[PDB]
Subunit: 362 residues, 4 copies
Amino acid sequence: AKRIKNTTPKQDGFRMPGEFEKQKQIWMLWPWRNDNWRLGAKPAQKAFLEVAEAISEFEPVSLCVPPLQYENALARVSELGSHNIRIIEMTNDDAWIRDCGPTFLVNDKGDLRAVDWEFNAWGGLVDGLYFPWDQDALVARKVCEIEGVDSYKTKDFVLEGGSIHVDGEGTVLVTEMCLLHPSRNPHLTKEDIEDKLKDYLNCVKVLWVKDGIDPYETNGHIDDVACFIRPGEVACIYTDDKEHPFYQEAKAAYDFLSQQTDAKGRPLKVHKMCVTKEPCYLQEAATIDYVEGEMAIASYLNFLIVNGGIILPQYGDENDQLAKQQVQEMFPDRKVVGVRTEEIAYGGGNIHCITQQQPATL
Amino acid sequence: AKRIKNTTPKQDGFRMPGEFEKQKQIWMLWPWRNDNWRLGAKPAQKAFLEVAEAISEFEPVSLCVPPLQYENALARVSELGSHNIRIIEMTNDDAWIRDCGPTFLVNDKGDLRAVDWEFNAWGGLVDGLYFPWDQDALVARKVCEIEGVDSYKTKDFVLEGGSIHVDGEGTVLVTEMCLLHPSRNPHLTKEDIEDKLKDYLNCVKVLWVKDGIDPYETNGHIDDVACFIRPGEVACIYTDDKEHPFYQEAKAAYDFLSQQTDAKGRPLKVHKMCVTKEPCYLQEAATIDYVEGEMAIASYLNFLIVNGGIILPQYGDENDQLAKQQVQEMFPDRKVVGVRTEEIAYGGGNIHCITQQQPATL
Amino acid sequence: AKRIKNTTPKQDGFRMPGEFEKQKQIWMLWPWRNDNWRLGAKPAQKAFLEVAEAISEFEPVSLCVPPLQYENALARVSELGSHNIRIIEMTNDDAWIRDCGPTFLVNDKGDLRAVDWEFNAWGGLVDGLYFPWDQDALVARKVCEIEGVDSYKTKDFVLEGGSIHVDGEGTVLVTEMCLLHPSRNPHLTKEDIEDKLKDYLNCVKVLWVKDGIDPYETNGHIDDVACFIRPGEVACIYTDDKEHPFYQEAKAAYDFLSQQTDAKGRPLKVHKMCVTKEPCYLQEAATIDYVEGEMAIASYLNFLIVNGGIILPQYGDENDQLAKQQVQEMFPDRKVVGVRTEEIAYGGGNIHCITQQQPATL
Amino acid sequence: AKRIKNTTPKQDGFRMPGEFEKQKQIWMLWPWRNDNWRLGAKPAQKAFLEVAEAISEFEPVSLCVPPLQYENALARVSELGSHNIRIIEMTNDDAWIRDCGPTFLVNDKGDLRAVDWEFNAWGGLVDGLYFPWDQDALVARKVCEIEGVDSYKTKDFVLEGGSIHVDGEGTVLVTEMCLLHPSRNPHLTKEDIEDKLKDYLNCVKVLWVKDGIDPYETNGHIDDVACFIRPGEVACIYTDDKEHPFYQEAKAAYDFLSQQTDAKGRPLKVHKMCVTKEPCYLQEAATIDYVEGEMAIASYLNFLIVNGGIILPQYGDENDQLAKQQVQEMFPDRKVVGVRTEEIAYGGGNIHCITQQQPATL
């Protein structure tokens, strides 16, 4: 479990494989802080428990929980039959393995590497969500240790997992409203940043969507608006309601996507996901310590692509059952499962934002 | 802040003054563990916040909270105007300052001493409520440190504050169903135990009530059935409902009390407190991690006696307003205040079990 | 990673395989508390680092360190080339994986099980070394979790790994001066205890050595006086110096061993290990916080038996090089390595007391 | 213990009184992290213990130690007789109460206020010494809580206590090489900064010394080169050795000081302190974990001015006894005591950098 430091994945012959490709398991943290999760985080925990139990039927889950809520998580995972879910002890300031976590790589020859980015809590001292983010910056290194996989460290380059989507071949989907944000690499030019993404992902081309539905939190991550459902085909939220908060950004994205081609050349067969018709109304906001009824993001594009299955969010919206239908179209040969991950949407992020899959090898 | 060790309070000329006597302030901890408090303890916290804000108008409060929920408690106490309530950092396994806390003393000459007992979580490895109780056994010593008050250490003698009630002069009210319990000094005889209580409290006489309404938790503490409302006059729960769970123990106590005299000789003018007509039905028991609707104790005798005021529990029972009336009779020249401390009654103990007053001096 | 609970290893067809048998890796904790280790434990740490680096050349090491000294241990293990040593995050009250750790099992068909005993810090509230031992009682369960191996829980049966030595077939070496100690199963008869050892180890016979060289610490563990070097052949300390502190216990053991046969019937070809000629003189005892020059145990019998190698202690004694020679005789076809594990001998226990090997499978 | 927020000390009629003025006690933290202190910090601790025991004979000490090293500090302070030293529980990333701590104020009418600055570990993410500095930014607020003293919060203004020295009347001694450093208020002009110092200190004039002997650590704090020994008279290091590392900065300072007048008008009767002739050679640097023989600052100007006493550093240098003589001249009517605070000088800062006095009141 060492650290390669004199070369880049591109030279070393590694590449972040498509989320859809075959994978050994999934990694996910455990919510605890009252600063962000209501009611001692008990609800969110149960919400995490389910989203975990869901991956169960498709592959194993690596649930990492802080030492203080360990005995608990283990008593609840055994309470659910306890199949292929393992509880490993791991500290974190907040449960967002998608961002702070490791972004694995592969050389297509069996070896499994990884790229550990710098994490500053989505912004840092300039615009970060919370302050002490040092334990999260450890999560990526720690998880590569108990897995026996070397890693590349992008020094001074702060990037979070759920801000980039990739397809098997040299192409990635970033959101300039975030990667260019001043609280994220303001010493690097849009040119420099592309080069990095090309060296640590092995993407000969970077598609720049241009506004996000995460104005001031994640700073407009792309794992909320679109993604790659297959090398060439992609997903994307789309509504016609000209009075819906995500209308323009979504359409602006759709127009960009549909008019965009990838590396190998094929056009992007853009798909259509739906958006809620009623935003999640935060309740019991009083139990959220400070250092109600306010709207919180709830996107169906926040789904995880395991092998032979899909874990989709079900907020209990009107256009809910439609989401499960739409996703079904995209991945016909994949059982789709849905969970009430609405309770975690009150924390700013969904199913995708709380998982991280590890590509299988041999 | 040293430790006297070669003499006892009796010889040193000190005595635990009556709870009613003049006092400088009140000490209380902060609930946090999910093992005992539902919903991340958020509810219980608010319940503690109030019971705290209540003492506010009578004297200052010393709210000690673990380092992890400090910023929070301070943001909520300032949110309530922030008058004479100070938040000091202090770790604890559970919020029960009444038991683990220090039992102050006085020489009636200005000096303030204290007696630190051994705490084993109400029983210990034999019948304790929880296991790691080492941080609580620190609370008493820690609080005597930041107050500049020496202390006496009763080595190998495990006693908890809320298991004994005292009146100004040589007399204390203990409950043999607890002090004699095998999980509490099974190497000491009922004779030995009395001697200790006489040396560290300066009580020339010990009244032995004989069963409690705390069968298997606190093991029948006396701070649930009765207490001293004035040197000579006492309180005591009493119901005629021969089908009420506390009926016999309460009556058995009343008969004992009324037939009992104190040290100075005067008879005990026994009073009458009421009991709920409906036991607190524990709800949302699922959010209580394990290593619903079950009844939980709810006694009105669990009131704190500050100077010029009374803090009484209000569970929202039928015989509730009656309790406030009854207590009013006892302490006419004392403003009585009541708070919904029902949420903490779900943790096994009330207002009294969560406070600890420090007698003023000069 | 579940828990079998209605049957015992004997019925389930599992058995603790000989320490010498083939093994996948070795588990070991990380010293930190100033209550026991001098100079902030920095020395002991380096001593652990080496003993770890030593196993390196024979098999992989699983170094589990508390979250507070994690970054450190990883910076030091990479500083040593970083080969097959992985640092996993794990909390513990003290580094003694040998005792609190899991005692693996095998069905000789590929499956890997385990038996988790109760740990009370060698005695408990009656004679334990330290008080809070709850985090250590977690170590065994935690390590079985990140390894995907079920376990058996011996409820109310407190036993520590390094108090029993086993040989492939139905036989184990226990030390009655410990297993019978009142601070360890005083509700179980010597008959009952044997039955347990027979059900969770699959040993049809238990050899009872009868005094140990650990009078009041570990309470006379057997992993200090003797062990099984091969099914039938054993090791054992032996000196002729009638003025040496371990003289009689050692000889008393030798006489017992040599006159004892195992399960299958073969006689025990007793061997001879040497003892130091100069006891380790504890220095700088002042840096050891309390809640100098005193002697501390230093036994050469405290060696770990990895596959194709031996890790032996080298205190810098006169009969030191002799120890390496003696052990060499016993395991001719095994490279013997020695490390200055004298610094950890100041903590009460050696190389063996700080490791725990996991038998390989397929 | 509230927070005044709509007015400044200047308007409110408060002013940081001279360090020499009468004071109630002294506050100091407790070293623990292995990232900075060698040998588990055990040595530095003892060094802190002494420097603490020293203040003992002049006034009371408020020793705040993290919860993990509490029992220890209390066992050592009672081991020293235990006079007027109280151990209060308080977490911190590092022991430097001088900087992170509160900078008290007074209205000369009895009331005691304070000014809490922003702390970013001497620089922050730009040039800070360590990363997680959130617990230290709590120390100032926490200590004002257990003392019943309101405070002023300089939002977005990061200043550390030991970077400014004041004399009773409108004058302060800052070091531009630090207060202007880019990692400390690079959004504020030298004009703006002076105004702040004038509003929260009540100093109608700011003397700008111009280079420090702390090149890249504290970034040239002034509490290393000079200070106010009396309103008008000051101290200052001075050597003639043109080959001494502090030569020019010291002389450059002396020339500046001597040519400078204060607010009330009187000239500054500059004094002369000596510098070591041999820099402290860091030893045993290996026991200092990383995320030898190198020189470390050792200034005699790092002395604390209690009432009726002086605590001066004694590194065991050639010009050591001279320092005690020199300081003696300055404060004739003050008993001078010296302690081997060389062990803490290996951490970057001395006696002054680790204390914080609270001005008495009535």
